Amino acid sequence: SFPKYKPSRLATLPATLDPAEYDISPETRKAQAERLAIRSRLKREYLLQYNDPNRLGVIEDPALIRWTYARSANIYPNFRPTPKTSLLGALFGIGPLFFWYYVFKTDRDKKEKLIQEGKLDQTFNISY
Amino acid sequence: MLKIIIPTTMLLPMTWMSKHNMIWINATVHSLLISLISLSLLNQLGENSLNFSLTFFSDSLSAPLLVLTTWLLPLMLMASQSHLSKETTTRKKLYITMLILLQLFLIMTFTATELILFYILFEATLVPTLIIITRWGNQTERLNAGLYFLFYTLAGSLPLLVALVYIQNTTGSLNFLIIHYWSHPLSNSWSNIFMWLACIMAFMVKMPLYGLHLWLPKAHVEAPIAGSMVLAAVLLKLGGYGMMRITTILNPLTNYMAYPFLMLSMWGMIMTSSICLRQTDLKSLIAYSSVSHMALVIVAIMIQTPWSFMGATALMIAHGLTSSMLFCLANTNYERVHSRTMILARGLQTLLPLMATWWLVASLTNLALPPSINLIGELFIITASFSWSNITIILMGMNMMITALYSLYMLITTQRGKYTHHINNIKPSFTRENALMALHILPLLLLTLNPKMILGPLY
Amino acid sequence: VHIEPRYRQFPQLTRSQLIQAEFFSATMWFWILWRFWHDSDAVLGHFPYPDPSQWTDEELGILPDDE
Amino acid sequence: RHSIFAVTHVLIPVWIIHYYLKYHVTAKPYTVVERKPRIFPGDTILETGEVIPLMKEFPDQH
Amino acid sequence: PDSWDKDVYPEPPRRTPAPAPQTSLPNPVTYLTKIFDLLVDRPVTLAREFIEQQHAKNRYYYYHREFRRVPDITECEEKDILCMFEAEMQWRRDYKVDQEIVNIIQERLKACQQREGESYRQNCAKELEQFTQVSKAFQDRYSDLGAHYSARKCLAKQKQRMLAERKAAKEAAAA
Amino acid sequence: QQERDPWYDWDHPDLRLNWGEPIHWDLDMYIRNRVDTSPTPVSWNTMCKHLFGFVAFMLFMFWVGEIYPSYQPVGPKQYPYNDLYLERGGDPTKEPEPVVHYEI
Amino acid sequence: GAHLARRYLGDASKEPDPLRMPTFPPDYGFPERKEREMVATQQEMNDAQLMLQQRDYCAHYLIQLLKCKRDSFPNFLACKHEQHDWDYCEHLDYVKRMKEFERERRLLQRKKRREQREAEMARG
Amino acid sequence: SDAPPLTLEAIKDRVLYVLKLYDKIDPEKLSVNSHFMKDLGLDSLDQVEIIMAMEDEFGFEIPDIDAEKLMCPQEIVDYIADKKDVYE
Amino acid sequence: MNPFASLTLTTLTILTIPIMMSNSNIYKTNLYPNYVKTTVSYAFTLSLVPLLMFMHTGQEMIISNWHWMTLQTVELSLSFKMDYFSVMFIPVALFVTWSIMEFSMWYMHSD
Amino acid sequence: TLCLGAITTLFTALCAITQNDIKKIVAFSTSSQLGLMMVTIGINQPHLAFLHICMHAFFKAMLFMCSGSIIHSLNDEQDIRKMGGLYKAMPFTTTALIIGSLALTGMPYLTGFYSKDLIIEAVNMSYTNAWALLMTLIATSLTAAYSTRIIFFAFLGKPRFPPLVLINENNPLLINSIKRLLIGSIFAGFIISNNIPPMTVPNTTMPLYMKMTALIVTIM
Amino acid sequence: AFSAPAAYLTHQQKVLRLYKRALRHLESWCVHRDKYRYFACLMRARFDEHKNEKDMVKATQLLRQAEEEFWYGQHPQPYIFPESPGGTSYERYECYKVPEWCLDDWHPSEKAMYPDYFAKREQWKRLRRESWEREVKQLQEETPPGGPRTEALPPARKEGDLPPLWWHIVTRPRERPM
Numbered sequence A: 001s002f003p004k005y006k007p008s009r010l011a012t013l014p015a016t017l018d019p020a021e022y023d024i025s026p027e028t029r030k031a032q033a034e035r036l037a038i039r040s041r042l043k044r045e046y047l048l049q050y051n052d053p054n055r056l057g058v059i060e061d062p063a064l065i066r067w068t069y070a071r072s073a074n075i076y077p078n079f080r081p082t083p084k085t086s087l088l089g090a091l092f093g094i095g096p097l098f099f100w101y102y103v104f105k106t107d108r109d110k111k112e113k114l115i116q117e118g119k120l121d122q123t124f125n126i127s128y
Numbered sequence B: 001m002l003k004i005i006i007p008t009t010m011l012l013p014m015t016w017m018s019k020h021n022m023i024w025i026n027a028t029v030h031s032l033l034i035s036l037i038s039l040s041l042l043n044q045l046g047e048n049s050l051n052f053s054l055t056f057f058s059d060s061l062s063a064p065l066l067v068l069t070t071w072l073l074p075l076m077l078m079a080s081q082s083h084l085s086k087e088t089t090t091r092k093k094l095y096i097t098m099l100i101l102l103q104l105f106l107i108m109t110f111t112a113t114e115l116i117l118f119y120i121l122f123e124a125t126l127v128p129t130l131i132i133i134t135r136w137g138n139q140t141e142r143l144n145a146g147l148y149f150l151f152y153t154l155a156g157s158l159p160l161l162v163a164l165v166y167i168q169n170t171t172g173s174l175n176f177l178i179i180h181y182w183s184h185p186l187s188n189s190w191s192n193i194f195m196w197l198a199c200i201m202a203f204m205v206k207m208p209l210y211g212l213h214l215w216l217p218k219a220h221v222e223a224p225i226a227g228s229m230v231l232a233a234v235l236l237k238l239g240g241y242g243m244m245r246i247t248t249i250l251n252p253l254t255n256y257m258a259y260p261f262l263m264l265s266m267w268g269m270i271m272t273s274s275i276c277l278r279q280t281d282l283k284s285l286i287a288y289s290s291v292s293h294m295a296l297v298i299v300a301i302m303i304q305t306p307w308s309f310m311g312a313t314a315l316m317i318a319h320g321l322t323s324s325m326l327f328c329l330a331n332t333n334y335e336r337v338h339s340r341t342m343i344l345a346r347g348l349q350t351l352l353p354l355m356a357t358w359w360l361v362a363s364l365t366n367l368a369l370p371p372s373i374n375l376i377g378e379l380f381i382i383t384a385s386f387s388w389s390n391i392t393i394i395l396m397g398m399n400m401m402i403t404a405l406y407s408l409y410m411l412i413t414t415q416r417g418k419y420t421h422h423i424n425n426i427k428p429s430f431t432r433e434n435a436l437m438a439l440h441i442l443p444l445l446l447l448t449l450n451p452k453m454i455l456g457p458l459y
Numbered sequence C: 001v002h003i004e005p006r007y008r009q010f011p012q013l014t015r016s017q018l019i020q021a022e023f024f025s026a027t028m029w030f031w032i033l034w035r036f037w038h039d040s041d042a043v044l045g046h047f048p049y050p051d052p053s054q055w056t057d058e059e060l061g062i063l064p065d066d067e
Numbered sequence D: 001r002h003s004i005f006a007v008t009h010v011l012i013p014v015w016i017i018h019y020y021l022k023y024h025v026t027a028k029p030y031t032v033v034e035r036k037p038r039i040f041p042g043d044t045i046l047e048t049g050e051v052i053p054l055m056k057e058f059p060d061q062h
Numbered sequence E: 001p002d003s004w005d006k007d008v009y010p011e012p013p014r015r016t017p018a019p020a021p022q023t024s025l026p027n028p029v030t031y032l033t034k035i036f037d038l039l040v041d042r043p044v045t046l047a048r049e050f051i052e053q054q055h056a057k058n059r060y061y062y063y064h065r066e067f068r069r070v071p072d073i074t075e076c077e078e079k080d081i082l083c084m085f086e087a088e089m090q091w092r093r094d095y096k097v098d099q100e101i102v103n104i105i106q107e108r109l110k111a112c113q114q115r116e117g118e119s120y121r122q123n124c125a126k127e128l129e130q131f132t133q134v135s136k137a138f139q140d141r142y143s144d145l146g147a148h149y150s151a152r153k154c155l156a157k158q159k160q161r162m163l164a165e166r167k168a169a170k171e172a173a174a175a
Numbered sequence F: 001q002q003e004r005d006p007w008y009d010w011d012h013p014d015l016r017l018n019w020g021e022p023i024h025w026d027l028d029m030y031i032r033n034r035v036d037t038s039p040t041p042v043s044w045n046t047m048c049k050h051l052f053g054f055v056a057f058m059l060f061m062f063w064v065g066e067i068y069p070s071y072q073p074v075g076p077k078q079y080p081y082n083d084l085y086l087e088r089g090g091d092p093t094k095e096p097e098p099v100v101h102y103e104i
Numbered sequence G: 001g002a003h004l005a006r007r008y009l010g011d012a013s014k015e016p017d018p019l020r021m022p023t024f025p026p027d028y029g030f031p032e033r034k035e036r037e038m039v040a041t042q043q044e045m046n047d048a049q050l051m052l053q054q055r056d057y058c059a060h061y062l063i064q065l066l067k068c069k070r071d072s073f074p075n076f077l078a079c080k081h082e083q084h085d086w087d088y089c090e091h092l093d094y095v096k097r098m099k100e101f102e103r104e105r106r107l108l109q110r111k112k113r114r115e116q117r118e119a120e121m122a123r124g
Numbered sequence H: 001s002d003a004p005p006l007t008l009e010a011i012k013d014r015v016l017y018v019l020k021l022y023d024k025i026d027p028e029k030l031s032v033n034s035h036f037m038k039d040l041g042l043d044s045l046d047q048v049e050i051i052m053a054m055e056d057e058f059g060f061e062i063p064d065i066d067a068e069k070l071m072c073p074q075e076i077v078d079y080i081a082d083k084k085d086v087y088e
Numbered sequence I: 001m002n003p004f005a006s007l008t009l010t011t012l013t014i015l016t017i018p019i020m021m022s023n024s025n026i027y028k029t030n031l032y033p034n035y036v037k038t039t040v041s042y043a044f045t046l047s048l049v050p051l052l053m054f055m056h057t058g059q060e061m062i063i064s065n066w067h068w069m070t071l072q073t074v075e076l077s078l079s080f081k082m083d084y085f086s087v088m089f090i091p092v093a094l095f096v097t098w099s100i101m102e103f104s105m106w107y108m109h110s111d
Numbered sequence J: 001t002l003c004l005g006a007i008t009t010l011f012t013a014l015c016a017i018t019q020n021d022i023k024k025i026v027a028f029s030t031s032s033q034l035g036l037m038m039v040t041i042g043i044n045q046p047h048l049a050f051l052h053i054c055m056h057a058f059f060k061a062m063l064f065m066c067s068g069s070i071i072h073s074l075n076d077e078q079d080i081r082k083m084g085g086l087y088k089a090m091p092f093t094t095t096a097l098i099i100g101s102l103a104l105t106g107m108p109y110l111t112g113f114y115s116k117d118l119i120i121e122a123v124n125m126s127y128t129n130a131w132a133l134l135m136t137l138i139a140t141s142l143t144a145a146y147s148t149r150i151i152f153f154a155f156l157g158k159p160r161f162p163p164l165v166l167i168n169e170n171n172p173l174l175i176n177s178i179k180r181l182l183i184g185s186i187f188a189g190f191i192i193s194n195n196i197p198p199m200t201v202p203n204t205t206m207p208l209y210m211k212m213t214a215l216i217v218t219i220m
Numbered sequence K: 001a002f003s004a005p006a007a008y009l010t011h012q013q014k015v016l017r018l019y020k021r022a023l024r025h026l027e028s029w030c031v032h033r034d035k036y037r038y039f040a041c042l043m044r045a046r047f048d049e050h051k052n053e054k055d056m057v058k059a060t061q062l063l064r065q066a067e068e069e070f071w072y073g074q075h076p077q078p079y080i081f082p083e084s085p086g087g088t089s090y091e092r093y094e095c096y097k098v099p100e101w102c103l104d105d106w107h108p109s110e111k112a113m114y115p116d117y118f119a120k121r122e123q124w125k126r127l128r129r130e131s132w133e134r135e136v137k138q139l140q141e142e143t144p145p146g147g148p149r150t151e152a153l154p155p156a157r158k159e160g161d162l163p164p165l166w167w168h169i170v171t172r173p174r175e176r177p178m
């Protein structure tokens, strides 16, 4: 009837436009129940320490610690040299260097060739 | 110049003969007095250096570094007495002894007239730093960090030693003055290429150069606060000083031997500035900031022009002060909350307003706001690079944006927003920390007032 | 000056603000009329724009298509 | 007490500024450079007393 | 004032026009300058007179340091370190003096541009020509020496330029 | 994090996070001071087309108006002294060829 | 606009080109032409420091206007005769420029039509 | 200065005022404790309209999860008082 | 000595005085905004005089007062350009700023 | 520079005519005026651009002050859709905003006339890009369009704000600042344009239709 | 914001939310009051036309078309209340909200002023301290053996009890703290 909205990576699909939430079945309701139960258990565990009058300091969150450890120290033990990893590493670590080397070498060679012929107009060029 | 060296060797037994509760006061007072004494080296000439004796000399490039070292020792002393309160008296004296020995080695390194003596002292600086890192660091990574700090250095410096003695068997002298006056061009042969590499790689790994920098995040993150201060503000400048010294004998090979290192420096400056944008650790962000600034300094030294040398000297001084301030600011929050994650303690401007002002000034100086000496050095280096090649203004310009972003990012992450609710152990800022911040920041603007003191011999 | 809320009625107006507003609107309109009476050329133009086609060939110096 | 603002915020700063510009800044060449005044036909110079001639007998397209 | 030599830092004769009023209304600028004079310029003058009276009772002098001329780098043996050192220091001093000469010429040029107003493109050609000559000489002398410059490198540059000029002259004589 | 419910009682209201729940790998990229992936009234691949079309049309129109300029029915402006030869840089020792303007 | 429409949509061969104009000799159509004169000396305009763009053929009126402006400083509404004289001079200058534009257009079109007619006559 | 310090009596007066302008409720039959479905015989759409009218009157939004629960004018007044930190 | 320079420099200099008293016992009281507003109004009134001087005579100047640092051949100094643009824009900006500050005294009363 | 100014002014004037936040409308108006200034610089008239800066400061600042007064009166509300009929409720604010809107649109002999009118008549008489000229004309029509939007939605009609009416503009500070900027926005253009030396060469001979182009497009 | 959420939203809840959103966006389109009332009555009739559908599948399908129509015809710039999560003053005063525990670190000179306030603070702290053991025990008793299943909290039932986990809800800083 009306023009359709198609989601993208940077403009995702709204909840009210999702077919998946308009055809439900009992196992989905059970899954939502367990999700809410997990959330409520974590909330209670947090709120018990949050309101404790004898609690002084920082409430340690294992989720934050796990996130930081995964982002920092777990990466190398779970690394394997694969064709994808090797190719991406070679590209992203070698290509830029040689690209910039070619660009700057070409520019400096052209400048030097101009200097040797004595035609660059270097007048008033005192400071270098 | 023994009038500066001897008082430090006297700081040693004064610390070891002090009463158990008066070590910090005596050490800080006499270190401040030694800094006041060392202030007299800024009176330089316009033609040659200050040749005190056959062993030691002072130049317009080394005097600001000596002043910075002697000024940094008391700041380390104030920054260290908080987390070492529960330590025994003997171990506190040992820690102060390590700091004093490091200062003595750095003072002798920055004034040695001889390249082998410079090598010996510049290598002796490793032992106190390694002991500090691996003994008084907090987490179990410190041991590995020490190893990463050690061999990365030594693998770069042992070839240099060989090259050095080789030079002494060819020219007959390694004294810097004779080396400068009797300089001769380097031919284009494989032997000369490898001699160039041997002479350069040690200082390039101490900068550190991009690709050779992996030791620096470990060393600057697992170290205690004084260790991080001395590693970032002074020990990184050994590479710059050594390259500025040793480049007098490498011409005209540098003219084409600098291309791989220039490419690495520029692209890795961009890369490390980008890395700073996604960092969950607040200390690692400052470490990578140091990497980016030192990449700029490497470019300045490698292009070999008077403006580049002036800008490089100014940038080393400014970076030392700024990075030390940033490390201390991060350590205050760490001591409060015992965690290094940046998004843990948020909205601290509400709870600590003066600390937020200190953070704002440090971040504004980090992004090279005019007319700070950070900007003076950066702009001189950028002008020299533009003269070298007009296209560099792209990459440099890119960096100028990225730096600002991540700099303000840190501020906006730590000071603005809303405070974390469950963190209730944030006490008011002590007078010691505020004094530390003020003594870091006031010299920066005072040098901004008189910028020719940190512009080096090419001024 | 104390002005209290009204809750669904017109707000309370003091005479001073009405006098000021009317005076300044009147002075704006007087200034416009006076300036237009004395500086009409600034809007209507001052010098007549000549048309080109009524310029004779004698003053323009074009030959009668012969030489 | 009334006009003390005009003394401590205008008179004192202008005294310091005038002294600094009169006896320190202008003690060096080219520190305060002023552009040359415009000279029109029929004018007389203050120092030399020279009068400038008139302007070439206007065609008078009145 | 007599603080600076008027030959090194020259200036035009400064002709200004006379006040030629045409309107009967008072000139507010005239009263403003009179008020400024009587209210600011006179107390400042009195303070300066007191300061100079105090200065006159304590007169001491400082002198310009004179340096002799020592042999240049051309008159030095290959490994004679003492003569090389003296010649090098003399060369550095001469380099500084040349920098200050260029500074003086540039100050002259800037002052001319500000002074001449809207006629600066025509009324400051002489200063531009002097700056062109001085800049060309300075660039031929000291440019491209780079960091770690010395008298030996400058001498090598001059010898290279001399060789190029001699070859050009000898080949042009063949034409 | 902009897509999370703003009316929920989050443990960290500014971050819109709860204590103990998994963080996500790119949390610092999505802190809502940053990259936003929320739904838009107009679809992606339609906003881009309109923006690119506007920009390209404006550029091509500017080029066309450059090569088809607008002006007034006048001759060039006349200046007396050989196009003010001495005023625009001088060189008074070259005697430049005279430029003459005739009445009309 | 109309000249723009004539040049860009009609025959541009007979339309004057503002960049390359005039394309005929100044003495071509006129038997003799008077040399346009100036009233202000170069030194006079230099002393007045008008502009490099205000030193046109109406510079004397501008100099007189500036002098009267300076002399009658507080009364900033007294130099209306001088402003009117300067405006009239610039208006006459613009009229002259328009006359040159039409002279060039007429010369272009007449020359091209006459060349076509002569070619046709020589083609028969 | 700024707006006066809103009180519980003022909030109750405003809510009752808004409700008494609704055509579907009898002003005489309406009380502070009257239920919307039970006593007044309204459906969910009328309750949504009432919540929207309260939002318009006081100039702040009530979330749907919280607005679903307010069933009597006293509950609306209480929610407004707890939202705006009113204690007298 | 040509009050143009002194007045032009004083107009800028007097604006920095409340910044210097920001650490004094007037920044901690409720009289600070009125103090800053009055300072800006006085600055506008003072800057009105160089504009009159320019409108009378067309006076323009540059003031290079402090020499900051000199490189080999490039000299860096603290210099101010006081031509038509500067002496025209300064009073307008000061007038607008004075009006905005008086407005802000009413708009940000509760801050 | 000329093309950048033309595209900026056209795009921002097109964006302003549908915005519902009053501050957004005034900000887009400021951006469009900066684009017009860039257009003036692009046709080699720097002094006209500086004059437009000086004349624009007055009415732009006082328009923002009027918007802030409206926002403060209506409990920090910024949407024009909830701003009803304030013509009689805010007499002085209405007077100031009307005068500023007429100055912004270059109504003759006001402050905005002496710069914008000359700028338009100067771009009309120059060897310039045709697309830039057309976009400048469309933008100076859209300027009057969005000024009409502000006035019509904010001051005319019936109230749309919450029933607790706290409207009160009887404060000497607000009145005095707005009155000062009002006197400026009325007289500064005349005073300044009559007291500066002529740093331009004026256009004294224009076709009548093209001399009135600004007035015609503003009225349309 | 005050009520504990449920595991899911019912069909009636979704319909009511869509009705409210449609009314608000239509009001954003129809600026004037009378036009808005006209079209709001039209929308109400459109909504209550299909109110009596016994087929749940067809009801949810009608709701699907309703959501699609709303997303196509929504206002790109809807009116937002200034303090709402999209408004111009959403978190304007969050920089002025200071937690109460900060007062525990005030210097005794600062506490010398406001003596009665700090006495009341001591009374409140003592009440919380006494209350905490009971609050924990009540939560222990009332919790199902498989952990809590919702985020709702029980009230106080005993003679002088307090509702468990009340301190940080009662001692909210303020809505306009400074």
Ligand SMILES: CCCCCCCCCCCCCCCCC[C@@H](O)O[C@H](CO[C@H](O)CCCCCCCCCCCCCCC)COP(=O)(O)OCC[N+](C)(C)C
Pocket (backbone or CB within 6 Å): B188, B189, B190, B193, B210, B211, B212, B257, B260, B261
């Ligand atoms: C992770 C980051 C660590 C730091 C990286 C440091 C970078 C070091 C790179 C060294 C720079 C250049 C080295 C040699 C100079 C020229 C290189 C060569 O490619 O140029 C040509 C050399 O020609 C050919 O390339 C021959 C060399 C080929 C063999 C070299 C092995 C290269 C493989 C790269 C491996 C990566 C090295 C780094 C390991 C970590 C020039 O032709 P030619 O004129 O004849 O040689 C000049 C010398 N002459 C005058 C005496 C004759």
Ligand SMILES: CCCCCCCC/C=C/CCCCCCCC(=O)OC[C@H](COP(=O)(O)OCCN)OC(=O)CCCCCCC/C=C/CCCCCCCC
Pocket (backbone or CB within 6 Å): B277, B397, B405, F032, F033, F034, F035, F036, J004
């Ligand atoms: C030398 C050329 C440089 C041109 C720039 C190239 C692209 C630069 C991209 C920078 C990437 C930085 C990533 C990290 C930055 C921090 C994250 C961030 O900025 O968050 C985005 C944040 C949130 O967006 P809001 O709309 O405000 O949301 C509010 C409602 N929630 O907004 C931003 O800051 C985005 C800014 C990025 C701008 C990138 C596009 C700029 C491109 C300019 C090219 C045109 C050149 C101009 C030509 C002029 C004619 C001579």
Ligand SMILES: CCCCCCCCCCCC(=O)SCCNC(=O)CCNC(=O)[C@H](O)C(C)(C)COP(=O)(O)O
Pocket (backbone or CB within 6 Å): H043, H044, H045, H046, K011, K012, K015, K016, K022, K025, K026, K046, K047, K048, K049, K050, K051, K052, K053, K059, K062, K063, K066, K069, K070, K071, K073, K074
């Ligand atoms: C502005 C542009 C966007 C426009 C979007 C709006 C257009 C869509 C309008 C048409 C959509 C519909 O009606 S979709 C109709 C959906 N069908 C049903 O709901 C049937 C079952 N009835 C119930 O669930 C309840 O009775 C209930 C109706 C919720 C009442 O709740 P209460 O009685 O307990 O308060």
